[PDB]
Every structure is written in structure tokens, then in C-alpha cells.
């Protein structure tokens, strides 16, 4: 592999790369926009050391005093049903509702796990509200305290709109301290000075400055039984999420994932990429048929199609290869099913019919042949009924309507297709048809599926394999040609079918083998 190879692979997989990268960037952007902004407040403390003062600031004695002063054990969260409802509500300009609770005593279930009892407060208006802990509905009003059902709650100054819910948790005093201690940090900022930089983070920019002021004043009033230089103010710019590093990592992570997936698909693919791969093995490729993006015969529906043009090139290559053949019978087979044997043989039969030749197309796929459906059919009396003796050769030949050639359909699907083709009647039909037609094209099942074509190929002067572009492997076509040779069938060459335009072929080989459009646009 070299620069051109990898660049051609990147150009070919550009939809995959762009889609995976854009999905990663979309997820990164949705996280950067929906993650809750976390602010930071800081204060400056003057110490007259400061290493023992750091551990006393972060102690449950000092921090516990702040929890008691500000009631930090009353956790109130706006109710949002999804994990993103909070972020998007912030984007819609909705100001988050906040309710001020000064007294809260829950019944304190204190069961095996839920040591944090919780209720749900649904705002009804500016004055009154509702409560439902476990379905028990209780109406409350701002002002008048509530002492019912073993639930004490005092809600002051509901600042929200009606209909909003709030989860009100009464978390234990240590849990309130541990939460504060996790977001609260102390530093020295000079490592020698009597300066302490207390920082505190949180989602509420006003609350965290009230907490850091409480921590400073409590540590101040406790120390005298020290100077507060800068009282706590909140930096209005959130510190998290850092949107730029998140989106940048989303782009970069999306690219390296796109690149390793493309790198895997390139090192794992085994199918044919160009006719050169088949010709390295000594297999003559007589045509490379592109995918026609356009029960119809393509050579009849769209004669100017790029695949019909490639099949005309096969018609002229075959006129030169089928000379010096024993008979005018051409068998078209392949390795795998749905490689294009019926597409190619029937469209080849149509392009040889317009040149004024008498062509017979035999649907010798007694298993899955559908050519009668593709040509318009009097389905009775096909090749099955003839081979089993219950039809004459004249009653099975039928004309393709928009075609120009006759065809024999497969008939009713026999139970013994490979043994019907071994009948001496099949060689009699070909010996008869080889006198009334200039060319007989026999469509057969694939050889790596069944053995029918090795039986039929005994009576064909020319046999061509159809290789599917990315679906077949070089070894698959080489195994197919040698299974024919082992049964006495000489394969003249191959027809590469289903080629698509690929920049990697243009860089790996000099040619993409696709073909040019050549028409006067009018």
C-alpha cells in the first residue's frame, strides 16, 4: 500500500467516513450543549503555615457547620423526565424554577438502601402547591407550615411556573458534607504565603458563592475561638463542560474510528477489484460490465445504457473468440448465484439479435430460471417437459417480444434437474437448434452451487464464466474454471460483471475499468 492506495480508499469510503465522523461530532456537540454548566466561585483567605489550616477547612466540623446554616441537606432538583430534559430546557431560554425551603422533615423511611427519603412537589400557582411522596397527595401553601402524615415541610417564595415538579430529597448530614467536600478545594497559591484560595464548583452560580461565603465566615468565626481578603464571587463563565475540547475530541475520535473501519474493510476484502486480478491468474476477461443503475431486458429498455455498451464490446470480442469452435453453442455460467449470468446471457442474446442473427436463448437453469418471466411466457412446455419426453422441440421454442431472438424456458421445476440434463434429448435439442439458429446461448446455474453446467458444458463449443465484481474472489473463479476442466469443459474466459467506479482502482491499477459515456447529449 502507498499514498495513492490509501487516498483512493478514503475517497471510496467517503460516505462512511463522513457519516461516522458527523455522528461522533453530533454526539460531542449534543453533550457540550446539554451537559449542565458547572460554575466556579473562589475566595481569598489571609493566614498569619496554612498547611494545617487547609485540613481544618475541609473538615466535617467546619463543613458540617455550613450544611446546618444553609440547610444543604435539603436537596431540591427541577424535575425533568429524560436525561437531557434539563439541558434542552436551558437552551430554550427557560429559566430554571427554584423554591426556597427552610424546614423539611420527611418520615425517614430509612429502609435497607434508600437512606435518602424523597418527595415530589408540583407547583400549582404562586402561592399553593402539592406534595406526593408515595402517591399520598397533600396540598400546601407558602407560609403556613405543613405537619401531616409524618411529613414536615415549609416552602417559602415559590419562584416557578405552575405545573413544574421538583424532587425534594432529605439527604443525610454526612452525604451533604461529602457532596460539599467533593466540590470544595483549598490551595495555597504561593506554597509559602499566608494566602488560601478557596474554590467551590457547582451548577448553581449564586448558591455556590453563598456556600463559599458560609465556609469562609464559619472558618473565620471558628479560628478566633485570619482575614477574608476576597469574598466569594462566581465566575459567570462555566468551567465545565469545556465545549471546544469536547467537540474537537469528537471530531478527532470520529476520524480515527472512521479510518480504522476503512482500514479494516480494505485489509479484509477479498473480492475482485479489477480484471487485472483475474488476468494475473491466466484467465481471459472478455468484458467488464458496469452496474446498470437504470422483468425487462436492459438491452431493449435502455439500448444506450453503459452496460449495454459494454455488452456490445463483448459481442464483438465473442465474434472473434467463438470462431474455431466446434458448434455455435455458447454456455454462460459462473461461480456463485446472482453474479449476473442471466443478466449477461440474456442481454448478450439481445445485442446479437439486433445484428440480424438468429439467436436461441435456452434457460437451462431448471432450478431457479426465471427467463420466461423476463421475456413474457407461455410457461407450459419448457426444457423440463422436453427433457422428460412430454413435449416436442417445436412446442418449447418461443419468441421474446421486444427481443428478436427465440427462447426456451426452463419449464416446470423438475425434481431431478441434474439428471434430466444428462438425457440424450438435450444433445438432440442442441444438434437440432444448432442448425436452425446462428447462435445458441445457454443460461445455466452456478457451478459452485450445482453440477448442471458441467453437464451442459459438454455440448457447448464456448463456455464463459460471469464473475461478480466485489462479490466473487479470484480464487472462486479459479476454482470454478478448474471444476469445469476436471469435467471436460474448457472455459474460454470470464466476464467481469457489476463493476462500479472506484478511485482505489485508478490508483492501485492505472484503470478503474468502468468505461466512458459517449453520446452527443441530444
Ligand X SMILES: Nc1ncnc2c1ncn2[C@@H]1O[C@H](COP(=O)(O)OP(=O)(O)O)[C@@H](O)[C@H]1O
Contact partner at residue 284 from its own copies, Mg ion, ligand X, none, CB < 5 to 8 Å by partner kind: its own copies
As a whole number of Å, the CA-based R_g of the chain is 41
Handedness of CA 345, 350, 354, 359 (dihedral sign): positive
Q: Are strands 406-408 and 359-363 parallel, antiparallel or unpaired?
A: parallel
Q: Applying CB under 8 A, which of residues 15, 192, 224, 324 lies at the interface with its own copies?
A: 192
Q: How far is 443 from 409, CA to CA, in rounded Å?
A: 10
Q: Which of 502, 501, 457, 508 is nearest to 481 (CA)?
A: 457
- Residue number with CB closer to ligand X (205 or 290): 290
495 binds ligand X (CB under 6 A): no
Q: How far is 434 from 459, CA to CA, in rounded Å?
A: 11
> C-alpha grid cell for residue 311?
455488452
Contact 409, 372 (CB under 8 A): yes
Conformational region of residue 136, where left means phi above 0, alpha means psi within -120 to 50, and beta covers everything else:
beta
User: Where in 249-288 is the site for its own copies (CB under 8 A)?
Assistant: 264, 267-268, 270, 284, 286
CB of 365 to ligand X, least distance (A): 7
462 binds ligand X (CB under 6 A): no
User: Where in 94-133 is the site for its own copies (CB under 8 A)?
Assistant: 95, 112, 115
Contact partner at residue 248 from Mg ion, its own copies, ligand X, none, CB < 5 to 8 Å by partner kind: none
Contact 175, 134 (CB under 8 A): no
443 is in an annotated binding site: yes
- Residue number with CB closer to Mg ion (50 or 342): 342
Rounded to 10 degrees, the C-alpha dihedral 229/234/235/240 comes to 130
275 binds ligand X (CB under 6 A): no
CB of 355 to its own copies, least distance (A): 6
- Residue number with CB closer to ligand X (72 or 499): 499
321 binds its own copies (CB under 8 A): yes
342 binds Mg ion (CB under 5 A): yes
Contact partner at residue 12 from its own copies, ligand X, Mg ion, none, CB < 5 to 8 Å by partner kind: none
Q: Are strands 165-170 and 74-78 parallel, antiparallel or unpaired?
A: antiparallel
Q: Which of 515, 510, 11 is nearest to 276 (CA)?
A: 510
Q: Which of 497, 453, 109, 18 is nearest to 285 (CA)?
A: 497
User: Where in 467-486 is the site for its own copies (CB under 8 A)?
Assistant: 473-476, 478-479, 483, 486
Q: Applying CB under 6 A, which of residues 497, 504, 505, 512 lies at the interface with ligand X?
A: 497
340 is in an annotated binding site: yes
Q: How far is 91 from 85, CA to CA, in rounded Å?
A: 10
Q: Applying CB under 6 A, which of residues 64, 97, 313, 337 lies at the interface with ligand X?
A: 337
339 binds ligand X (CB under 6 A): yes
Alpha-helical segments (H) within 105-228: 173-183, 205-223
Contact partner at residue 340 from ligand X, its own copies, Mg ion, none, CB < 5 to 8 Å by partner kind: ligand X
- Residue number with CB closer to ligand X (214 or 342): 342
Contact partner at residue 216 from ligand X, Mg ion, its own copies, none, CB < 5 to 8 Å by partner kind: none
3-class SS letters over 58-89: CCHHHHHHHHHHHCCCEEEEECCCCCCHHHHH
- The backbone torsions φ and ψ at residue 264, rounded to the nearest 5 degrees and listed phi first, read -75, -45
Distance between alpha carbon 399 and the CA centroid of its chain, in Å? Answer: 47
Region of 174-182, 297-305, 336-344, 382-390 interacting with Mg ion (CB under 5 A)? 336-344
341 binds ligand X (CB under 6 A): yes
- Residue number with CB closer to ligand X (87 or 445): 445
User: Where in 356-375 is the site for its own copies (CB under 8 A)?
Assistant: 367-368
Q: Applying CB under 6 A, which of residues 247, 307, 400, 489 lies at the interface with ligand X?
A: 307
307 binds its own copies (CB under 8 A): no
Number of Cβ within a 10 Å radius of residue 344: 25
Contact partner at residue 334 from ligand X, Mg ion, its own copies, none, CB < 5 to 8 Å by partner kind: ligand X
Q: How far is 498 from 45, CA to CA, in rounded Å?
A: 77
Q: Which of 99, 100, 76, 57 is nearest to 214 (CA)?
A: 57
296 binds ligand X (CB under 6 A): no
- The backbone torsions φ and ψ at residue 52, rounded to the nearest 5 degrees and listed phi first, read -70, -25
User: Where in 87-106 is the site for ligand X (CB under 6 A)?
Assistant: none
Q: Applying CB under 6 A, which of residues 275, 340, 409, 457 lies at the interface with ligand X?
A: 340
468 is in an annotated binding site: yes
46 binds its own copies (CB under 8 A): yes
361 binds ligand X (CB under 6 A): no
342 binds ligand X (CB under 6 A): yes
For 348, the enclosing helix (H) or strand (E) is helix 341-353
**Count of residues binding ligand X (CB under 6 A)?**
14
338 binds ligand X (CB under 6 A): yes
342 is in an annotated binding site: yes
343 is in an annotated binding site: yes
3-class SS letters over 355-405: CCCCEEEEECCCCCCCHHHHHCCCCCCCHHHHHCCCCCHHHHEEECCCCCC
CB of 201 to its own copies, least distance (A): 17
Peptide bond into 152 cis (omega under 30): no
Q: How far is 23 from 128, CA to CA, in rounded Å?
A: 46
288 binds ligand X (CB under 6 A): no
303 binds its own copies (CB under 8 A): yes
* Binding-site ranges for Mg ion (CB under 5 A): 341-342
Binding positions for ADP are 290, 292, 338-340, 342-343, 370, 468, 497
* Binding-site ranges for ligand X (CB under 6 A): 289, 291-292, 307, 334, 337-343, 497-498
Binding positions for Mg(2+) are 342, 365, 443
Amino acid at each position: 500500500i502507498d499514498l495513492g492506495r490509501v487516498i483512493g480508499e478514503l475517497i471510496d469510503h467517503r460516505k462512511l467516513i463522513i457519516s461516522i465522523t458527523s455522528v461522533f461530532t453530533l454526539f460531542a456537540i449534543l453533550y457540550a450543549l446539554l451537559a449542565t454548566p458547572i460554575y466556579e466561585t473562589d475566595a481569598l483567605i489571609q493566614i498569619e503555615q496554612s498547611a494545617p489550616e487547609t485540613a481544618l477547612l475541609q473538615s466535617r466540623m467546619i463543613l458540617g457547620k455550613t450544611i446546618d446554616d444553609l440547610n444543604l441537606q435539603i436537596q431540591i432538583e427541577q424535575k425533568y423526565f429524560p436525561v437531557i430534559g434539563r439541558g434542552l430546557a436551558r437552551l430554550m431560554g427557560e429559566k430554571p424554577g427554584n423554591i426556597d425551603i427552610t424546614r423539611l422533615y420527611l418520615p425517614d423511611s430509612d429502609d435497607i438502601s434508600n437512606n435518602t427519603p424523597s418527595i415530589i412537589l408540583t407547583v400549582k400557582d404562586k402561592e399553593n402547591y402539592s406534595i406526593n411522596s408515595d402517591g399520598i397527595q397533600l396540598n400546601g401553601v407558602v407560609g403556613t407550615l405543613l405537619n401531616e402524615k409524618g411529613i414536615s415541610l415549609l416552602v417559602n417564595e415559590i419562584d416557578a411556573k405552575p405545573g413544574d415538579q421538583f424532587v425534594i430529597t432529605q439527604l443525610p448530614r454526612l452525604k451533604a458534607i461529602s457532596d460539599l467536600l467533593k466540590s470544595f478545594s483549598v490551595a495555597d497559591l504561593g506554597k509559602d504565603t499566608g494566602m488560601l484560595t478557596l474554590t467551590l464548583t457547582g451548577d448553581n452560580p449564586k448558591r455556590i458563592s453563598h456556600i463559599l461565603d458560609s465556609i469562609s465566615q464559619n472558618y473565620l468565626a471558628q479560628n478566633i475561638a485570619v482575614r477574608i481578603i476576597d469574598n466569594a464571587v462566581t465566575d459567570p463563565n462555566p468551567v465545565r463542560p469545556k465545549k471546544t475540547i469536547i467537540i474537537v475530541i469528537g471530531v478527532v475520535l470520529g476520524l480515527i474510528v472512521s479510518v480504522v473501519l476503512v482500514l479494516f474493510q480494505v485489509f479484509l476484502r477479498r473480492g475482485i477489484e479489477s480484471p487485472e486480478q483475474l488476468e494475473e491468474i491466466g484467465i481471459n476477461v472478455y468484458a467488464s460490465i458496469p452496474i446498470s443503475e437504470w422483468d425487462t431486458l436492459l438491452a431493449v429498455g435502455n439500448p444506450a445504457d453503459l452496460a449495454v455498451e459494454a455488452i456490445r464490446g463483448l459481442r464483438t470480442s465473442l465474434h472473434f473468440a467463438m470462431m474455431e469452435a466446434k458448434n455455435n453453442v455458447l454456455m454462460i455460467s459462473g461461480a456463485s448465484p446472482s453474479a449476473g449470468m442471466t443478466f449477461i446471457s440474456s442481454n448478450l442474446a439481445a445485442t446479437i439479435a439486433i445484428t440480424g442473427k438468429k439467436v436461441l436463448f435456452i434457460d437451462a437453469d431448471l432450478r431457479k430460471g426465471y427467463a420466461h418471466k423476463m421475456f413474457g411466457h407461455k410457461n407450459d412446455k419448457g426444457l423440463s417437459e422436453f427433457l422428460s419426453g412430454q413435449a416436442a422441440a417445436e412446442m418449447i421454442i418461443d419468441k421474446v417480444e421486444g427481443g428478436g431472438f427465440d427462447y426456451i424456458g426452463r419449464g416446470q421445476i423438475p425434481p431431478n434437474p441434474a439428471e434430466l440434463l444428462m438425457h440424450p434429448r438435450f444433445e438432440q435439442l442442441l444438434n437440432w437448434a444448432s442448425q436452425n439458429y446462428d447462435l445458441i446461448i445457454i443460461d445455466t446455474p452456478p457451478i459452485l452451487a450445482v453440477t448442471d453446467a458441467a453437464i451442459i458444458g459438454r455440448y457447448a463449443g464456448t463456455c464463459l464464466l460471469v464473475a461478480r465484481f466485489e462479490k466473487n474472489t479470484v480464487k472462486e473463479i479459479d476454482v470454478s474454471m478448474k471444476r469445469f476442466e476436471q469435467s471436460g469443459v474448457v472455459v474460454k474466459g470470464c466476464i467481469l460483471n457489476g463493476v462500479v467506479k472506484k478511485a482505489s482502482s485508478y490508483y492501485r491499477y492505472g484503470h478503474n475499468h468502468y468505461g466512458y459515456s459517449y453520446y452527443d447529449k441530444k
